[PDB]
């Protein structure tokens, strides 16, 4: 049937947010923030008044989405009065930011109706001369993503220029800095802080479960005539969101208490609404929410217990022996030889208790040890996993770690999982559960 296919496509498009503007679903808890951002951007573009603002909030807190929605709404009517220049604090470095600003200036100027040519200092002086300096002036709306990287510890050359530019220049200027840190104002130096408009609007948060369930209803209730099923499906969802005991409401409560992030629930719903092949399957799956449980099991199926249940017998024996040695040691450190000695003592004790277990040799337990440290069950003595940035990673790459040169037997490790948790996980019926405690 084509009707269910069209309904599925429309519903999943609604879920992903790619629905055309002027009908995009907006939640009821960020409507105030949307009105505030709309107020700022309209007061700046319509009235050609320049000002700055920094958005703050966690990841996926609807700030890039909200700004993009505002720009799309305001672009369908007033397109010749503003040019959008967006920088991202991650990919745009300090030197490349000037090049990016110049390139986007020239591109938007060409689109509405050179700068980027020359050295970087020539580029900077050119953009400064252009922009810092009846008809109106095309306002340049800047959008900084992750402004905390440009905030920096020392230099702050770009932020000072842009805030003095919005404070003193003639052409109207916006700058929206979408950063994450709550103490963003502590990042900016004294001069940049003085230049900054001292206006920060904090992203709204889900304060009540009713807010999340209303947002889910707004997100998943198609409100247009596309397929013959739209009249049916909607009321079904209403029922599923009317009874508190209903499974979907229970999962919403779970997400609210654990994650409290609507994008996680949306990423869970999308495969649920894409797997169904007919309307009956979709209705029974939204009533049962079995696929939500399958998705939750799969997400957790590889972290530390989904890993732990994939261990073979010898691998589990070596893991338990290493945990024993780590717990017996004062600092928790151990090495290959101590773990193997404890393992062989354990196997000898089990065999003397006695069918027969093959005590694997050293050269056959070496492979199990390598597999076990490869699955990130062990770590090196004092090893930092990933460096903060590229410079530190390069410095580490040039250096030669001492643990590399030490022979394989004597490398001192440390344990991800303590022995008590190992006892907590391993089933009672297993044949190594006797040695899981001292």
């Amino acid at each position: 049937d084509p009707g269910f296919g069209s309904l599925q496509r429309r519903l999943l498009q609604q879920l992903y947010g790619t629905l055309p503007t002027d009908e995009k679903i907006i939640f009821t808890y960020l409507q105030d923030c949307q009105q505030e951002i709309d107020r700022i951007i309209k007061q700046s573009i319509i009235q050609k008044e320049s000002h700055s603002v920094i958005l703050v909030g966690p990841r996926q807190s609807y700030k890039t989405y909200l700004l993009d929605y505002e720009l799309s709404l305001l672009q369908q009517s007033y397109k010749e009065q503003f040019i959008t220049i967006r920088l991202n604090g991650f990919i745009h470095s300090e030197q490349t930011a000037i090049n990016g600003i110049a390139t986007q200036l020239e591109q938007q100027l060409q689109k509405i109706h050179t700068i980027s040519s020359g050295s970087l200092t020539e580029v900077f002086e050119k953009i400064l001369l252009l922009l810092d300096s009846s008809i109106t002036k095309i306002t340049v709306v800047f959008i900084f993503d992750e402004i905390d990287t440009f905030a920096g510890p020392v230099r702050q050359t770009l932020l000072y220029n842009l805030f003095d530019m919005v404070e003193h220049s003639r052409v109207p200027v916006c700058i929206f800095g979408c950063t994450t840190k709550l103490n963003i104002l502590e990042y900016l130096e004294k001069r940049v802080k003085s230049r900054f408009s001292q206006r920060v609007i904090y992203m709204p948060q889900i304060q009540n479960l009713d807010d999340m369930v209303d947002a889910v209803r707004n997100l998943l209730t198609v409100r247009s005539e596309i397929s013959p099923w739209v009249s049916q499906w909607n009321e079904t969802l209403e029922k599923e969101l009317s009874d508190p005991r209903s499974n979907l409401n229970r999962h919403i409560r779970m997400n609210f208490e654990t994650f409290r992030s609507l994008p996680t629930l949306k990423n869970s719903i999308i495969p649920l609404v894409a797997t169904s092949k007919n309307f009956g399957s979709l209705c029974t799956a939204i009533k049962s929410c079995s696929f939500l449980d399958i998705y939750n099991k799969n997400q957790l199926s590889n972290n530390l217990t989904g890993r732990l249940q994939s261990l073979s017998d010898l691998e589990l024996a070596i893991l338990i022996s290493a945990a024993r040695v780590a717990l017996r040691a004062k600092d928790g450190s151990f090495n290959f030889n101590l773990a193997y000695a404890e393992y062989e003592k354990m196997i000898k004790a089990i065999n003397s208790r006695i069918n027969t277990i093959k005590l694997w040799l050293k050269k056959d337990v070496k492979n199990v040890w390598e597999n076990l440290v490869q699955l990130d069950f062990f770590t090196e003595k004092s090893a930092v996993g990933l460096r903060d940035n590229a410079t530190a990673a390069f410095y580490a790459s040039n250096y030669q770690f001492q643990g590399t040169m030490i022979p394989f037997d004597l490398r001192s490790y440390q344990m991800q999982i303590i022995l008590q948790e190992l006892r907590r996980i391993i089933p009672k019926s297993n044949m190594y559960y006797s040695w899981t405690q001292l």
């Binding site: 050119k126 409290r260 996993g385």
Partner: protein
């Protein structure tokens, strides 16, 4: 051809000459009248600023609406007779005038806290002195503003000066030697005085310690007719950077700027609103357009006590003029937002402000959000913070191993097995509600909540590969976390 060991194809070199000014003329006696040459000084090349000006101009407009508070917001910005800096104005103006009518080179080093009028007052001094020179009272001069922090590299500021006094384009080394030879060997007969405003000297010095020495030494030469007005934040920048001997052998007038008092800031704000305070405006209810002297006459005034309290609050902490201007503008914006909230005027009988609006703006500026950010976090976030606080109280090391956090969370959630929330939160917190999911060693949202806290700048985790023993500290003060947990309804019960 050769095989390149590495390629850089994005290199872009400007067209800048290399030969300094020393070798340009081949003879000191052959130096012409540098005052009257086609390219030297401000005698050509004004077309570039006119080229980019028309780039951003549009040809479309549609009945803009200027509300009653738009005038206040436009007149209260930092873009625009300074009464509160008259003493320093007079001092620096006297120094510059004495140095300019006597054909002598001097240096004025002025320093102070950000946003106290230093750049504004020096620019006003230069404008007034240029106006006096227009009356043919002192030899003519050119003003070259060299902002340190508006430059890609610190050594750029040399060539700019040359490019602004010689019309040529030279690299930084050639510019150094050219400026030195122009300030040392060119006779005073064939030179025009130069005033240089080394704005933000703090960024120029850095590791180099070269810009500041060159600029404070070029004023020592008798041939050079240069009045260097350096401005900075730290008062002790010269004596520290150059050394006592050099800062003594160079005699430069030092000026220090003090942050405005509450009376001075109130005077600044009142002077900036002399033309709008207690004014009559004609406003039409159809659109809301306000015209200064269905049409209604509305009186606009800004409450004196609101300005007084705003100035008192902003001066007691920093005294910066810009912060006072911005907070007053924000209060006016709040009043205007309320105005269109009540009316609904959109875009395309006495209206005033109140101390409540100014207080709201000041509270928004001052009060933090961490105490409010915690209280709206998920249950697992508050549980993590509670376990961190408990372990910090027990150990006292104000940092905890992460696996120890996990153990404390497990113990805390298993001891309170009778608390009315716990028996139904444990299932959804360790198995995520459904069965077929084995007992999870960590919480369901452990990684999510940990990254949510680390990203929010509210918790610092050192980098280590072992997630069991990596330590986490609370960047926020411990009192905030305790208050936030006390604000919760179920955490305080257990």
């Amino acid at each position: 051809p050769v095989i390149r060991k590495f390629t850089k194809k994005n290199v872009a070199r400007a067209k800048k000459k290399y030969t300094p000014f020393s070798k340009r003329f081949k003879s000191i006696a052959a130096i012409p009248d540098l005052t009257s040459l086609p390219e030297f000084y401000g005698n050509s090349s004004e077309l570039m600023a006119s080229r980019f000006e028309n780039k951003l101009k549009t040809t479309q407009k549609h009945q803009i609406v200027e509300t009653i508070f738009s005038k206040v917001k436009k007149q209260l910005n930092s873009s625009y007779y300074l009464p509160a800096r008259e003493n320093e104005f007079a001092s620096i103006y006297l120094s510059a005038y004495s140095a300019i009518e006597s054909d002598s080179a001097t240096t004025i080093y002025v320093a102070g806290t950000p946003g106290v009028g230093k750049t504004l007052t020096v620019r006003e001094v230069v404008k007034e002195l240029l106006s006096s020179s227009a009356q043919r009272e002192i030899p003519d001069f050119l003003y070259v503003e060299i902002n340190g922090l508006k430059m890609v590299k610190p050594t750029d500021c040399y060539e700019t000066l040359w490019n602004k006094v010689s019309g040529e384009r030279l690299t930084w080394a050639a510019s150094m030697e050219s400026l030195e030879f122009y300030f040392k060997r060119v006779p005073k007969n064939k030179k025009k005085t130069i005033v240089v405003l080394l704005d933000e000297l703090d960024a120029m010095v850095t590791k180099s310690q070269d810009i500041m020495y060159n600029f404070f030494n070029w004023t020592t030469y008798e041939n050079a007719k240069l009045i260097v007005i350096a401005v900075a934040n730290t008062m002790d920048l010269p004596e520290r950077q150059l050394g006592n001997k050099i800062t003594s052998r160079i005699g430069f007038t030092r000026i220090m700027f003090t942050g405005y008092t509450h009376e001075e800031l109130k005077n600044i704000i009142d002077l900036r609103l002399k033309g709008l305070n207690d004014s009559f405006f004609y406003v039409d209810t159809k659109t809301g357009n306000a015209i200064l002297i269905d049409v209604r006459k509305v009186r606009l005034r800004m409450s004196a006590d609101a300005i007084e309290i705003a100035s008192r609050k902003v001066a007691s902490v920093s005294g910066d003029a810009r912060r006072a201007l911005k907070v007053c503008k924000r209060a006016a914006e709040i009043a205007e937002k309320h105005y269109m909230a009540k009316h609904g005027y959109g875009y395309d009988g006495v209206q005033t402000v109140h101390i409540t609006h100014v207080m709201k703006a000041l509270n928004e500026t001052l009060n933090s959000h961490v105490i409010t950010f915690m209280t709206r976090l998920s249950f697992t976030a508050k549980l993590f913070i509670y376990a961190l606080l408990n372990l910090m109280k027990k150990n006292g090391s104000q940092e905890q191993e992460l696996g120890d956090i996990v153990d404390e969370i497990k113990l805390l959630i298993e001891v309170n097995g009778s608390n009315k929330f716990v028996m139904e939160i444990a299932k959804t917190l360790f198995q995520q509600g459904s069965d077929n999911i084995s007992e999870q060693l960590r919480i369901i949202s452990w990684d999510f909540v940990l990254n949510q806290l680390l990203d929010a700048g509210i918790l610092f985790k050192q980098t280590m590969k072992n997630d069991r023993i990596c330590c986490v500290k609370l960047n926020i003060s411990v009192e905030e976390a305790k208050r936030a947990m006390n604000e919760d309804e179920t955490l305080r019960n257990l």
